[PDB]
Amino acid sequence: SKEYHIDEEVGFALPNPQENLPDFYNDWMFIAKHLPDLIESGQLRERVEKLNMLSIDHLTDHKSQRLARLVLGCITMAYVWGKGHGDVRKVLPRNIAVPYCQLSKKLELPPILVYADCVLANWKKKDPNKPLTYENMDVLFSFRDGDCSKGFFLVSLLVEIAAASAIKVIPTVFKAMQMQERDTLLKALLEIASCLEKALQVFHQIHDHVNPKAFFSVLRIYLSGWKGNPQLSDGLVYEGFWEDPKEFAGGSAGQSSVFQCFDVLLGIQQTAGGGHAAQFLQDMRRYMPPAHRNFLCSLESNPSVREFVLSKGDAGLREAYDACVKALVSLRSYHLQIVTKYILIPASQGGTDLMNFLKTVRSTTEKSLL
Ligand code: HEM
Ligand SMILES: N#Cc1ccc(NC(=O)NCc2cnc3scc(C#CC4CC4)n23)cc1
- 256, 112: one domain: no
State the Cα–Cα distance between residues 137 and 217, nearest whole angstrom. 25
Q: Is the beta carbon of 308 within 6 A of some atom in ligand 1?
A: no
Closest CA to 118 of 152, 146, 166: 152
Residue 125 carries which DSSP code?
E
Contact 326, 370 (CB under 8 A): no
Are residues 342 and 365 located together in one domain of the fold?
Answer: yes
- 303, with CB counted inside 10 A (0-12, 13-18, 19+), is exposed
Q: Is 91 helix (H, G, I), strand (E, B) or coil?
A: strand
Is the domain of 368 the same as that of 311?
Answer: yes
Question: Nearest ligand to the C-alpha of residue 212?
Answer: 1
Q: Are residues 228 and 268 in the same domain?
A: no
- Cβ(120)–Cβ(156) below 8 Å: no
Q: DSSP letters of 176-208?
A: HHHTT-HHHHHHHHHHHHHHHHHHHHHHTTHHH
Specify the ligand 1 atom closest to the Cα of 361: 41
Where in the sequence is the domain holding 137, given as residue range(s)?
A: 18-145+224-248
Residues 77 and 174 in one domain: no
Q: What is the CB neighbour count within 10 angstroms for residue 52?
A: 6
Last residue of a domain, one of 194, 213, 248: 248
> What torsion, rounded to 10 degrees, do the Cα atoms 90, 93, 96, 100 define?
50
CA distances from 329 to 98, 244, 254, 266, 326 (A): 43, 42, 16, 12, 5
- Assess whether the C-beta atom of 110 lies below 6 angstroms from ligand 2: no
* 239 and 186 inside one domain: no
Q: What are phi and psi of 125, to 5 degrees?
A: -80, 145
In angstroms, what is the resolution? Answer: 2.2
Provide the 8-state DSSP code for 287: G
Pocket test for ligand 1, best of 161, 335, 354, 362 (most atoms within 8 A of CB): 335
Q: Whose CA is nearest to atom 28 of ligand 1?
A: 156
Note whether 104 and 169 are same-domain residues: no
Q: Method used for this model?
A: X-ray
Q: How many residues are listed for the chain in this entry?
A: 370
**Residues 138 and 256 occupy one common structural domain:** no
CA distances (Å), 364 to each of 244, 271, 290, in order? 38, 10, 26
Integer Cα distance of 209 and 151 in angstroms: 5
Task: Give the chain's domain count.
Answer: 2
204 plus 70 within the same structural domain: no
Regarding whether 166 and 117 lie in a shared domain, the answer is no
One domain for residues 243 and 209: no
**Residues 125, 237 within the same domain:** yes
CA of 202 from ligand 1 middle (Å) equals 14
